[PDB]
Request: fold
Amino acid sequence: DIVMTQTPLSLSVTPGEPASISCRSSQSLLHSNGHTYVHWYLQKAGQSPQLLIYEVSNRASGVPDRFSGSGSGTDFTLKISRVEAEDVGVYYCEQTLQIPFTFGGGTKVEIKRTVAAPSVFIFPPSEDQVKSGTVSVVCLLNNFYPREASVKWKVDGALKTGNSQESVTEQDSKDNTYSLSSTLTLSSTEYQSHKVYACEVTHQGLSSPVTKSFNRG
Amino acid sequence: QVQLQESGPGVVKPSETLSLTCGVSGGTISSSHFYWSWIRQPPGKGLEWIGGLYINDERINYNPSLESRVTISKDTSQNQFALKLTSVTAADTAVYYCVREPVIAAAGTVDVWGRGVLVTVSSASTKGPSVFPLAPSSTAALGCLVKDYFPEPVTVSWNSGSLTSGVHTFPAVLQSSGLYSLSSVVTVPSSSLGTQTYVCNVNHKPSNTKVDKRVEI
Amino acid sequence: AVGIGAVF
Reply:
């Protein structure tokens, strides 16, 4: 199988400057008929892939002049002369020279903006939740940039690993920020076996850790 | 002109057979110079090519990593493109796309993709969610935990869809129980808590479940 | 994609 290697994994662009993504094949994509069978797609969030460029350099029929493709052989480059808000998403290269067709791992293109620290909120679980027999304690990190962030759960001052799950939104189209939920899930018994619950947040927009806590009841 | 309309069951039990259909709106499946493909995308993991067929010679190609289990057919009787996959496991949970590709640029300067259908492989029973309000213990965050549902997806809105700014609905996570959980939050002016009511509306279409919860402090 | 090599 032909391996397609895409770089970088992720790119941050401020709107209007060019972007350049790289794709390299494990073997030549030139057919003896003289065509080179490599293609570029954009897949926006929750949407199906959209063909941007076919056979290295040609533009698919509805794609603006701002997208262009270059390269030969084994090395290919997609260029976006000016990235606009509408161009965010995951770009893929693909070869259709040999069976099976194979795609690159994808390049996530996001919008760069000023570093923004998260606003942190902790939600004590409602009585309904406690009578249900299992409880979820939610810690919300809202409207931060960039996407990297750390959340530690501390129960009665002790670090608590496991029993927690995280989830992150796509980049918000208005302010280019991210939000994150960290949910610590416990049984009602274990949950009521402790008193102080805290989520401790670190992020490069912060000068020091941010801790939000509550005493159960 | 041509649109690919996918359909199939959302849930398939493990070891059973997945079956998907791709209807051809605005044309016939027997048009010359087109290649028909099935591609899948596991949640958050990139695109895998399954197989395809070339109309002019009716050669059918399979990805060797799946070739044992997959059947791809053209169905002239129903103007349909079909995929069947036996002995499915959780590894086959993915969004499935059919695509029509012009094998030559004279036949077309763009391909056509179906909207994509989510197929979940699980033994869980279709179940509506429990909804719990999330209240804090200058600006305030409120939310709702949408818990213990199967399968995906769920719809969350605020105040019957009239409140959309500052709303973040986080991607669901699969629990060890095999059910999903997510949270939806919104930031509001604290000034407003005395005169405004906030209600999360949860619509779980696969189970016909509709739940409203008022969030208050 | 537009253009399929494996077919030729």
User: Anything to note?
Assistant: The interface with chain A takes residues 37, 46-49, 52, 61-65, 97, 101, 105, 109-111, 113-116, 130, 132-137, 139, 141, 143, 145, 147, 168-173, 175, 181-183, 185, 187 of chain B (CB under 8 Å). The radius of gyration of chain B is 22 Å. The first strand of chain B starts at residue 3 and ends at 7. Residues 174 and 180 of chain B are 5 Å apart (CA to CA).
